[PDB]
Structure formats: C-alpha cells, structure tokens
Symmetry: D2
Subunit: 291 residues, 4 copies
C-alpha cells in the first residue's frame, strides 16, 4: 500500500489570458477536465489515497468537481499551497499526509498514454526504497529536464535545462519515492528562477546512488500541457484515438470498475448522469458484451 500526491496548483502563466481566471488543471483535454488525466495514472498504479494540492482560490472548484472521490471509489484529500513556491514543496505541505509511507507524485499538467502502461506502473510501484523517474525521448532536449544513464539506468546525471549536451531522455512529471523523500525536500534551496525545484530532490537520490530510471518506450505518448499550442495538440490527440480506435483515455469510473473499486451499480449511476454525453454512452456500453 502506497500513497499518491497531485500538484494541481501553479500560476500557469504560459496559458495566460485564460489562467487568469481558472486553474490550468480544470481546463479541458477534449471531453475531460485536465486533472482527470494525472489522476487516472495514479489509479492505474493502484493507488487509492490521493492528496490533491491546489491554490486557495481554486480549491472549491476541484471539490465541486471531484468531491471526496467516493464517486470513483478513491479516497481524496485536499491541501492548499498558499503561494506557488516550487514542486519540492509538495512533500513539505504533504508531510502529515504521507506520514512515513512511500509515495507517487504526478504533475497535474501531464498526459500519459500507452498500451500496457498499468503493468509497468505497478512493477515500479512494487519498489520499497530508492527513487524511480520516467524518461521520454524528446527532440528538443534543451527546454526539458534530461537524465543520463547505462545498464540498470541508475542515471549518471540530471542536467536540467542543459546549456549544451547530455542525453535526449527528458524526465516526466511521474515520480516515485520512499520515506527519505520528506527529508530531501526539507533541505532544498530556491532555484535561480526562485522555487523549490523537484529536480534538486532528485539530485540527492542520484548521488545517494539509488535513483533508478524507468524507460517509456515507443508506443507511449507523453505531453506537458502548459502552453496554448500543446493544450490543443493534447485535445486533438485524445479525440483522435478515442474516436478512431474506440477506447476512452482517463475514464475514471472505468478504471475503478475493472480495479474492483466500484461495482456495476456505481458505474451505472455515473453513466446515467452523463447519458447525454459521449462519455456516458461509452459507460453504458461497457455494461454488456458482443458475440
């Protein structure tokens, strides 16, 4: 049993005219609120206790949209991050929550998708001790955090915003840790930008020499929706595969269902209140079979 956290705060300045009003994580990726995506990841990893960190201003909107999470058969807790001081701060803010157990942090503006992702997730979630990060092959390795490594990964360097070289495997917003995490967090100096950067915490695990690295292969898709254009690419992608290939991405009630987290009765209440929606029919359709 492990716990999960989702950073759903931030000022989201790069989407600015828009995020001046509503939190970036409430914006839509096709037919589902953005936060539905990072959440589904944690659920595919089999994590039911999840703390969502948001700004004081957006909180009620998230609660208004997710409630206590009982609708998805999960236990949701909320916590406010007063000012956007950096990612590492999640562990400080989430100390009392994590207690002393191991965790999983997922950035709120990240979309992940590939065949047989759930397993890969579980396996890595079977690691008591250490720290795993998920790299992805980028074409623009400068404007992304890079991680080097060799057989067994281990990682030999985590040069972020490399001034010139490194490797081309960017590290995504999917992190796994262990107890020592609240520790490393408590000691972290504000970056030039001026925020407790999660990279600093990952640095420590590298030297401590227990920073394994999970490889996200070819069939895997990864996006960091935080700019006007990437927000569109994300939407268009999900819409394309959902309509073209017949399955839904980040459909929470469906993930819960199969995970035995909620009974057919539960899925039916959901599909009903969404019946007028393509998301709802997709749910009604799962309530049967073909020849």
């Amino acid at each position: 049993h492990m716990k999960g956290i989702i950073l759903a705060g931030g000022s989201g300045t790069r989407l600015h005219p828009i995020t001046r009003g509503v939190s970036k994580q409430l914006l839509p990726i096709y037919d589902k609120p953005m936060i539905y995506y990072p959440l589904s990841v944690l659920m595919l990893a089999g994590i039911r206790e999840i703390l969502i960190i948001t700004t004081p201003e957006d909180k009620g909107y998230f609660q208004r949209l997710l409630g206590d999470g009982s609708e998805f058969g999960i236990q949701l807790e909320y916590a406010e991050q007063p000012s956007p001081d950096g990612l590492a701060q999640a562990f400080i803010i989430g100390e009392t929550f994590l207690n002393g157990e191991p965790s999983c942090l997922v950035l709120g503006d990240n979309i992940f998708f590939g065949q047989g992702f759930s397993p890969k997730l579980r396996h890595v979630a079977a690691r008591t001790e250490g720290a795993t990060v998920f790299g992805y092959q980028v074409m623009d390795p400068e404007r992304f955090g890079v991680v080097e490594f060799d057989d067994n990964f281990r990682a030999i360097s985590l040069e972020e915003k490399p001034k010139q070289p490194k490797s081309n495997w960017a590290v995504t917003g999917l992190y796994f840790y262990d107890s020592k995490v609240v520790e490393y967090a408590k000691q972290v100096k504000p970056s030039e930008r001026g925020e407790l950067e999660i990279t600093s915490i990952n640095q420590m695990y590298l030297e401590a020499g227990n920073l394994t690295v999970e490889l996200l292969g070819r069939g895997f898709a990864w996006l960091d929706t935080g700019t006007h254009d990437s927000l569109i690419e994300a939407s268009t992608f999900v819409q394309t595969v959902e309509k073209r290939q017949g399955f839904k991405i980040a459909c929470l009630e469906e993930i819960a269902w199969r995970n035995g987290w909620l009974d057919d009765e539960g899925v039916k209440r959901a599909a009903s209140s969404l019946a007028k929606t393509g998301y709802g029919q997709y749910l009604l359709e799962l309530l049967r079979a073909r020849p």
Copy 2:
C-alpha cells in the same frame, strides 16, 4: 448610445464531465477564455456598457478574469442568475441595468467571425426601433431555431427545432432590441423544455411586424460551442486562421485600441503582462509598422 448584455450562466450539461467544475464560458477557445468572443462582438458594435449575467458560483472567477473592464476600456457590471431559468430572463434580471434604453444580447457560447462584420454591426446598431436577429445557413435545421422570411426578410415564421422543414437559416445568438424588450420577456411562459425561451420574445416582434432579419453571408463563420466536439472545432478554427492568416480573433485590447477606447500606453501594459504569450507578442507587434 446603446447597452449590451451577455448571458454567461447556464448549467452547460452537454459538456458535462467538465462543466461540473467550471463554467462553460470560462473554457478556452484556443488561447482565449470563451467569453472573450461574445464580448468582442459587443465591442465591435461599439458598446461600452456591458452587463455580464453569471451564476452565483462562477461570478468571482469572471471578476477575477475581467475585473471592472477598465483594462479593455469598457464599463463592466455583473449580476447573478440564481437558477438557469431560461434566456428571456436576462431582461428581467437586467431591468434596472438597461433602464429604458435599447440593447444588445449575445449568448456566451457563440463565436462569430467574418470580414466587414463590424460595419454590419454598427449599421444594425444604429437602428432605434424594432428588433434584429441574425441568420446563418446551418446544415442541421432541426437542431436550431430557424427563420423563414421574404424580401427584406421580416420573417414570415420562426419555428423552434422544427421537427420537419422551414428554411435552412438558423437564428444566431446575437440580438438587438429596443425598450419594448423587457415588456415582452415578462409575458413569456416556460417552453415544453421548462425554460423561458428567447424565441418567444422573438415571436412577439414577429407578430407586431417589427422584426428585421440580418443574413450572415458567405465569408462569415459561426459556431455554438456547447458540445465536446464543437468546442474542439472552434479551437482548431481560431488557431488555424490566426496562425495561417496572421491576425488575432477576439483580441480585446486590440479592438479597444482602434476604437480609441485605450491609448498605446494601455496596450503596452497589457502586451507586457502577456509577453511570454503569443497573444502578447501580437500586441507588441501592433506597436509599430513595416515598409
């Protein structure tokens, strides 16, 4: 001098998993909040006094995003619609605001765009006496309120979601009314659907013979963003013409500027706070010229 109102409430059920958290009118059409679009219309019509009607829950989000409107050189007032009882209700709720003057109602989920649009708005705006609705040839007449008319228009009929024929021109969410408007709305009774329909207010100017129709010809684009798919079509469209043809749609500060509503100094404060955005550079670029 005329006044404008924008219906920005509603339950937005057709976009449901999403609108369970944030109002539909705060969602993005590419790089701008949806409401930026109906608003720009009123501004292109030369209207500075605008009342925005929203739900009690979303209000602060709108204020948080639009303020008093001084940033766009316009006078914004807000009012709450307790429960989504229909469109005609805007005039009831907006009585004290309209006072006795003529008005312009624009639905919050409507995107309008074409060349020469404004001149067409001013002309239709310069009228003081009657009512004015715009048609657009839809391909789904059933699913739209339709206007049959004759020479000069007038409109012999106006059948709602005509389960059968009519004509193929749908009535867009753009309307112009005179003082008799608030009078009408008070005598509208709930449709079979249970809301107070704007169509009723229109069936009244029809009979009174005071109902002119304005045709949204060929080069104009019209959308009613209220479904998951139309929300994407809208976004993709604005992104395509903005990037392909070089201008911005519904860029408020730019509309204000040319309208002499705000000085270069004003446009510069804006473009600055958006500098990290494509919307911002577009603004910086207008602050000059080419050979």
Copy 3:
C-alpha cells in the same frame, strides 16, 4: 503458403475533381502512398506473392512506385482490369494467378490498424477451408454492408446497405477465401448498381454454411478512404499516432525486416534513399538500440 490480391483500380468518383488525373490508390495517407496500407496488411499476414489489379492507365505509375516488390522482399505481379466492372471480378481476372490455391483479398482504399493485429491475421490465415470476413462497428450501418451473426458468429444474414436495420457491424475490405472462390465469382450477376459485388460471393459461403466472422475489437481503427473528408481523417490519424506515439504505420521495409524478408543491408539501402525524409530516419533509428 497462401496468395494475396489487392484491388487497386476503380474510378474513384467520390474524390472526383482529383481522381480525374491519378488513381485513388496512389494518393497520400500522410507520408505514404495509399496502397502502402492495404499491402502492409497482406505482409503482416505473412503473404509474399501478391497480385495488384489496376486500371490500364495507372499501371505504369504503380510499377514506377513499387517495381517487382523485391525492394520490400515480396513478389509482386500486376494485372489490368479494362473497365471497373465490380469486385468479384478480381478472382476471374486473377484465376491464372491464384491457380488453385487459397487467397486473401484486400480493397485498396482500406486502412487497418491495431495492436496484436498480425497474430490475429496469421490465425485467420492458417485456416484452409471456408471463408473469413472481418467486422467493425460502424455508426453508419446503412452506408455499409453489415453482418448479423450468432455465437462464434457464422452470420445468420448479410444485408447490403440495409435501408433499415440488422446489426451495427460493417464488413471491412479484408477477406480470406479458399479455392471455391473463383468458382463462386463466376456465378455472380450484376447488382442493381451494375457492378459484380463481393457481397454476392459472400452470400454464397453464408448459405453453404462455410462463412466465419472475425470481430475487429476495440483497440483497432478502420477507415474506408474514398471521400474527400475521410481522406483527411485518415491522414490526420496516421500523422497523429505516428508523431504522438513514436511508431510508423504501414512501413513496408520495417515489416519485411522483422519478417526476415530483408536483411539489415536491405533496410539500410532504403533508409538511405529516403534519408531526407522522416520515413528515412525512422529506418536509420531501427538500425540500433537504447540502454
């Protein structure tokens, strides 16, 4: 060992201004000629002897683009269909070619794609006796040939463009036949539409009780590129998953390579002559591995 045929003729009237010049099957689905797609299917089914039936006018263009097929490690033969008299005619025209062996017909304007597809093809291919058609749940049953079936399938019926009901599974342009095939095609008479329909050949295996159905489940995508809009949907789809998920669809040299049909040396000559292309680099990249 089995043989395959690809119908790549037709008048392609629905894409008309365009197909007045070039055959529909030479048009592009993103970065590859349309015909590359039906072909890859046959290759994924492990079929190396393939007859391509084209019009007399387009022939040299196909040869000019595909040659004898040695570049993809396959044996290509060509044959001309004088006039577009229907699909069943492929077996007549292809008699001398098929000889007495079993076959596989794939329409030229069909795009197929899903995970685990091949294994499914081999299994359906390993059969020697009967007939095999694939269904895909369309949303437009009228506009498609449909298959009603029961447990194991069989198919109780097969109504063409059923002006009324049936089921919602459309018969894709992928078929498997045995020697009795050419026998059937000879006794097919022209439909009301005036062509010799493949459906007729199918109605014959139905009655004979030798007609199995293969369901193209959820993760599979299917398209019939023959209209201006579906041609765009297809392109946009392949481009999206290729760029989003990192693999190439219908990349012949790559299919050949893994099938042991062509050596690394072969793949390198190809990737070289395409080096200036994204298709080429994808090939160079397969010529190695990662940690």
Copy 4:
C-alpha cells in the same frame, strides 16, 4: 494582355516515398489537385494563356486532368522539362511560347489565399517593365529566400538561404517579369546545388535596379507544400476555412464564371459531373441567390 507559366515538374524528393510514383503537383490539397491552386492565382490575375511545364512522365496525367483548359475557359499549352535542371530554365523552355511578351511565373507547390488578392494581383499585372516579387513574413527566415528593401521597396538585397541575417520577408513562388526575362535566363550559372535558380535571375533585376517588391499583408496565407507535414497543414487549412467560412478556395469554374470566361451553361455542365461531390453542390448553389 500577358502570359503565364506554371512550373509543375521537379523530382519532389522531400515527399519521397509518395512522389516516386506520381508528380507532387497532382497530389491533393483537400478536395482539389495541387495544381488547381497555382492555376487559380493566374486566373485571378486575369491571365488566360498558360503554359504548364511538366516532366515527360507526368504529362499525360496532367492532360488527362486538365485537357486543353477549355473546361475552365482558358488556353492551356504543355511543354516537357526533360530533367529537373532548375527554375530559371522555365524561360528557356518557354521561349517560343512567351514570344516577346511579359509574363507571370507561379511555382506549382505554392498555395496563396487572402481577401482582396485578385486586385493586388491585377494592379501588379498592370506593370509593363521591371520585375515584381511577393514577399511574406516568415518566422524561419533562414530556410527561405529573403528580400530587403525600403520605401517603394526596390529591394536592396536578395540573400537566399542567408547564412545569418537579412530581413524576415521570404519571397514566394509568385513572380512577374517583362521581356528582358528570357534574356537574364539565358545567362545563369548552375548553383552549388546544381540547378538554374530563379534567384539568380532576380539578382540581375535588383542591380539593373528595376526589381519592385509587392507586400503580402496580414490577412494573407502562404504555404509551400513540399514536405509531408506542410502538405497536411495545407489540406487542413483549406478544409477548415471552406467548411467554417462557406467559400471555396481555388474553384476554377467559379473563377472563370465571374471573369466572364464561361457562361452559366458551362458551370452547370461542370457542377453536374461533380454533383456527387461537395465541390459540385457548391457549384449548383452559385446558380441562384437568397432573400
């Protein structure tokens, strides 16, 4: 009265797996063959005598698709360019055709579109003597031909593939000349790449000091469809504005019609043979009016 030429040859290597079979200019930009676009430009400029230069292999396909051009009320002549030796060669190859008159060259892979383009065209086509080129604002001024200038343009430098600076106004595939053109062409040395580059000919006019420069403003869209990705952008663009804004781009019969080049009777024969197509209905619809 002036003459026009369209370079529709080339090896089109950047679209390679595809162009190994069919000429790039026969590929589709949505619902119309690519060549329909450059052609429409010449027609919007009011030019009826047009020479199309193609490869020996593609010729019959173009003829098969365009005939003598009488269907669009224009006089089409064809000429073969044996080997793709460069653009300047058009004037050599087209000497006997141009005779001694002034001309207009339009590259075959260029798509142009903006409101009030036709006028701008005509005006520039009213220039006997000199040479006009059309620049467009690019964001990637390196991989494009640049042109500097000041009041009256004149152009002060034509640095192509600038190793480092210049201006950001790329020059498009739309050129206008005068007699002295066959002259300048006859004397041109093969570039490093190894082809008679049109840029070399434009150089001469700059020094001769009679190389005016037409400015393609904001609302204008320009694309150079010669790569897999730009081919898709082009299609998606045309499809978007055509469906979103209700008009057709590069609809030849319609351009002829208004130009008085072909009578209603002619447009009706066309719309008929395309009736099953969206292009055809668009034509039937122009054969009337609304209230």
